[PDB]
Each structure stands twice: as C-alpha cells, then as structure tokens.
C-alpha cells in the first residue's frame, strides 16, 4: 500500500525532527558541562599544588625498621620519640637528636609510608615531576621501603595501582594517559638497562623539544599496555637486578596525558630511587646528590647536576616545580650507631637550610 | 512510486535509529560528565579548605549583591573578575588599590546556599572544640543582614548553620551528648541590649522559634547583632559566633576600633571598643565583605575592599 508508506514517511519526518532538535540541546548542555569540568579541574589542580607547597616541595622522613627474628639479640641503641617529628638515639657504652617532616617507627606499615606519597602521584598526573628516594646504610630498609615484599608491598607497587585507577578515572575528563616505563641501575658511574640483556652504552642528553628535559640513548622504553604488561616488566627488572649494595636503582614512569578536544598535554614523571648504601667503605653520585639537594634548599645560582650520572639523570625532577620525598632508612642496632648517625645528619643539613 | 518511497522509508528508518543511538550516547556522556563535575567540585572545595587551614586562622570572602528589583535605572560601576578569588572595580568615568584577592569572591548570582557551603567547614570545627567568629562587614545597603539572617523565602547563614549543626550532633550521639547554650544581643551606642539572658536548648525547632523571636524583636541599622552559640559535649567545649555589623560608611566608633583591633591580631589593644571585648576569640574566624555594585557606592566599596585587603596581612 502506498498510503501506508506515505504515512510512515510523514511520521518518520516528524520524529526525525524532534530528535534532531533534542540532540542539539544535549550537545549544547554537553558543551558547557564539558567547559566547566575542564575549568574546575584546572582549579582543583592549582589548589592541589598549593597544598603540596605548603607542606614543602622537598620533605624528609625517617624510618627505623623493626628488628629481625633472625638476630633477636643484636642490641638496639636507645630510641626516644620526643615528638611525631623529632627523634633521638643514644649508644650503649652530647645528644643525637633530629627533626623530620615525619618519623616512622618499627610498627609503621607500608600503607603508612604510601600515605606520604599518594598525593604526589596526582601531582605527576597534573604534569609535575616527582622524586621518591630511599637513603641509608645497607640493612637499613631501603629496598624493603621501595619494592618491599609480596606479603607487604612497598611504594612502587602501590604507585602503580594508584596510577591505573587514576588513569581510568581521567578518561571521564577527556584525558588519555600513556605511561612510559624505564628501569635502570647505576654502578661506578655507568648506566645499565634492567629490561635489556645486551650490553650497550647509554648517555644522558638534552631532549628534542625541551633543553631542560632529559633523554637517554639506547634504553628500553616500554609503553605500558595494561597492569599485566607492567607487572611483567616489573618482574623482569627485579630479575636482572656486594655490588647491589653499591648500585643505585632508578625506576621511572613518565605520565603523558593528551586531551585531544582541547589540545592540551600534561606530562609529569615519577622517579622512584632505591639509592645505594650510605656507608663509608656512591663515591661520586651519592655525594653529588646530597650536595644538589642542599643547594636547591639554599636557592643557589648554579647547580652541578652534571657532576654525576644520577644528578644528571634526575635533573628535570629536582629544580623548580618538582617535588621530592626522601626516606631515610635506619637500623635500630648498636653496631650501626655511628653510621645511623651519619644518615640522620643529612636531616640536620636539610633543615639547617632555613 | 512504490519503489521510490520504499527507498525513502528505509533511508528514514536509518536516520531515525542512527539519531536515536547518538541521542543515546549523548545522554550517557552528559550523565557521566555531570557526575564528574560534581565530584571534581567536591575535591576542589575540600582542598580549598585545607589551603585556608594551613595558611592562617582567618578567611575573607567578598559578596557582591545583584541590583534590586527597584533599581534597574541605577548606574553600576564596572566589575571585572580574574579568578575565583580576585576581583576589580573601575569607576564609570574612566591611584591606589583597585584589584583585590580574597579566599572567595561570590558573584551577584551566588545563592544563599553557595555562600553557606563555604562556611559549613567551620561549623563542625566548633563541635571539635574551637571558637568561630563569622563577621559581616559592608556599607548599609550591601548584603550584611541578607547574608547573615536571610529572608523567609531564601534562608541566610545563621539559620542554615542550625540545620547542619543538628545533622552533626545526631552523628556524635552514636557515646557523646551536647548542650547548646544560646545567646542573642545588639549594640547601639556602647549599650549592651538583649534580644530575649542565655537559654539552654534541647530541640531543633526550639531554636527556629527564639531565632524568629530575636529577628522581629530586633530593629537605625547602625548596630551590631552578635549571636553566641556556645557548645559543650560530654562523652568538646567550643562556640559559634555570628555577627551582623553596623554600616561601614561615613559618620560608629566601635567599627573604626574593630578595624584597629584586627591589625593587632594578624600582627600578633583592647577593649577600647565594646564589641571587641565581648568577642575574645586558637580561633578560626571568617569575614564577609558585602559591597554594592553601584557607581555612587564606588568610593565606599573601595573603602571596604581596601580594608579587606589590609586584613590579608
Ligand atoms: N619496615 C620493615 N618491616 C619488616 N622488615 C623490614 C623492614 N625494613 C626492612 N626490613 C627487612 O630488613 C632487611 C634490610 O634490607 P633492605 O632494607 O630490604 O635493603 P637495604 O638494607 O639495602 O636498605 C630486609 O631483609 C627486609 O626483609
Ligand atoms: N544576594 C542577594 N540577592 C538578592 N537580594 C539581596 C542580596 N543581598 C542583599 N540583597 C538585598 O539588598 C538589600 C540590602 O539590605 P541588606 O544587605 O539585607 O541589609 P544591610 O544593608 O543591613 O546589610 C535588601 O533588601 C536585600 O534583600
Ligand atoms: Mg637494598
Ligand atoms: Mg541590616
């Protein structure tokens, strides 16, 4: 029937028009709602950075680890908690008393450490560069603090979990993030790619599009596909890892946020560093690191970032906007007393610079 | 013909279903977008509270009122906003402070709800144990009373606190109970009048009554309406103080002395005033700066803003 179809047409043209009109309203609500979300996040980002700056752009923390079941009779020096931020030790045989942004004691969980770190993962997604360092003599807690242990995982694994949850969320704002992972060791001034097997030679060079950012030649830079992929690379890296005690390990995650609708990008790094041991027998990098950090604090003209591989590697995450956490790991025992004191005296130098 | 318009109906069945799916994805996107916007704005407000906590015990907000029903003919000065917290006004006829930074600047279209939203945080602090002073400053005509008390149709801050403040306490009685010594008083010329003599409260509606009492029982408007709300709790001593002040315009010694007194505190001198003693606040205080958008209130606004600025020092 022709009248049937003539009717269906006339009816579809009515419908088609009410939809076309409705879709134009939705679109126009979307456009402004899209605009107010972008701006609101811009504002949330700035309020966040301000809270980080008020707490301090570089912050030092202490963590005395528990004793080991193994040696239930290494004598521990006398530890005394003057407050939540101040700590003192005495040898068994002046006063050794040190202030920090926070002191973590032997029953502080991994979770508790991460609480100091998780806010900075956001700073990295907002486009800032972050350094988390673990410092102190061998035995003192560094590896346990950064990598940790399957039963109680450390900073790095927690960072990854938060990174994927956070990235999932960001899609709802139009941001498509991409992580670039790299793992490397540093020994006697030479870099080693822990994702490679071939022995190759890698130098640190100025970037393509920013003379202040850094570029490492001939390193494996993996674009993470999902957590499973990262999990694999993590595992792999641990595999290729008294040399280990004198090697610095740097895990780096470069967050690369593209917002196509607005054509803005947001790139921030995370630099997770299991430093080498602070014990007197590193000769170059570890000493230069400590100078570089202290110089930052004193607001000095020029800074010898290029006097060492490590300070060169981390240069774009040490000046200016970057934020920096430093976890001083310490062993409670008496035979570590003098070395523990050396460790803690960097805390003294740090806040000696105000 | 049968061929022709059978082609047509198919083509339209496509555009129809095609547009319906696109209407569908839009619908969803919008629902998502609004959720996220809500969520982003909440985090923003929580950070904004943190920032004000960590940097001092004294917040300053500025509210510009919209022109009144009966004032379409009135000439407005030019208002320029740079930030959520930065505002500038220029005279209409084309040296010194002309652009001011506060903790928040509220537009003429700011609801009584949005204003209170920013004070909410300080209320719960009082339960926690602190003394809160909420001042309203400005020239007569500006917004002090409207903002503080409000009007039966769109309630102000003083009432709104009550709502939240009970929402709070039912949460606390869940091994903690709270007594609420209330207080209401005015100040004309150094004279300590009443408005009811403190009266302990035991009900949500009980307030709204004596709240309604003092209101009508109150009054020209060149007098301070203080309103203590002392709170104690036993298993948390504290207070809330809410103040609508006398006009800030040209002659009120108490105000010029209120000013003097605050230069001292921020600078870490009383009570030369009467209000100043009464309010002896370890105490988070907030201040509203009400301002009129009109060109004949220009210099007076600049008086208020420049005063608000010095406060931020
Ligand atoms: N917070 C802690 N809780 C329990 N065990 C810890 C803690 N910190 C370190 N350890 C243990 O102490 C030892 C110290 O080595 P580790 O800190 O992992 O590397 P490094 O000694 O090079 O800093 C490890 O065997 C680890 O099991
Ligand atoms: N945000 C606002 N929205 C609408 N009207 C307002 C607003 N603020 C003040 N007004 C009106 O402007 C007038 C100014 O008086 P008001 O500010 O309430 O008392 P005071 O001048 O003592 O501060 C009132 O009539 C009030 O209703
Ligand atoms: Mg180690
Ligand atoms: Mg009034």
Numbering used by the authors:
A (entry chain A): 292 to 384, 392 to 539, 548 to 587, 599 to 671
B (entry chain B): 292 to 385, 391 to 470, 472 to 493, 518 to 540, 550 to 565, 572 to 587, 600 to 616, 621 to 633, ...
Could you give the paper's own sentences about this structure?
The new Ncd dimer structure (2.8 Å) was crystallized in the presence of Mg-AMP·PNP, but was refined with Mg-ADP bound to the nucleotide cleft. The dimeric motor shows the stalk and one head, H1, rotated relative to the other head, H2, positioning the two heads asymmetrically with respect to the coiled-coil stalk. The new structure resembles previous mutant Ncd structures that are interpreted to show the motor as it binds to a microtubule in a force-producing conformation. However, this is the first detailed report of wild-type Ncd in a stalk-rotated conformation. As in previous stalk-rotated mutant Ncd structures, the two heads of the new wild-type Ncd structure are thought to represent different states of the motor – H1 shows extensive interactions with the end of the coiled-coil stalk, or neck, while H2 shows disrupted neck interactions and appears positioned to bind to a microtubule. The two heads differ from one another in the conformation of loops L8, L10 and L12, which are ordered in H1, but disordered in H2. Strikingly, Ncd H2 strand β3 has moved upward from its buried position in H1 – it does this by gaining a residue at its C terminus (G434), as well as its N terminus (N427). The transition of G434 to a β-strand in Ncd head H2 β3 shortens the adjacent P-loop by a glycine residue, which may make the P-loop less flexible and more likely to release bound nucleotide. This is consistent with the reduced density of ADP bound to head H2 compared to head H1, supporting the interpretation that head H2 is releasing ADP, representing a microtubule-binding conformation. Loop L13 is thought to mediate stalk rotation in kinesin-14 Ncd: L13 S639 hydrogen bonds to G347D at the end of the stalk in the Ncd G347D mutant, disrupting neck-motor interactions, including N340-K640 – these interactions maintain stalk position relative to the motor domain and when disrupted, the stalk rotates. The new wild-type Ncd crystal structure shows movement of G347 towards L13 S639, as observed in Ncd G347D, and disruption of N340-K640 in head H2, indicating that this interaction is also critical in wild-type Ncd.
Kinesin motor proteins hydrolyze ATP to produce force and do work in cells. Despite their diverse functions, the kinesin proteins contain a common motor domain with highly conserved or invariant sequence motifs that mediate basic motor properties, such as microtubule binding and ATP hydrolysis. For example, kinesin-14 motors move on microtubules towards the minus end instead of the plus end. Here we report a new crystal structure of human kinesin-14 KIFC1, together with new crystal structures of Drosophila Ncd, a KIFC1 orthologue, and human KIFC3, a divergent KIFC1 paralogue, and an analysis of the structural features of the proposed KIFC1 AZ82 inhibitor-binding site.
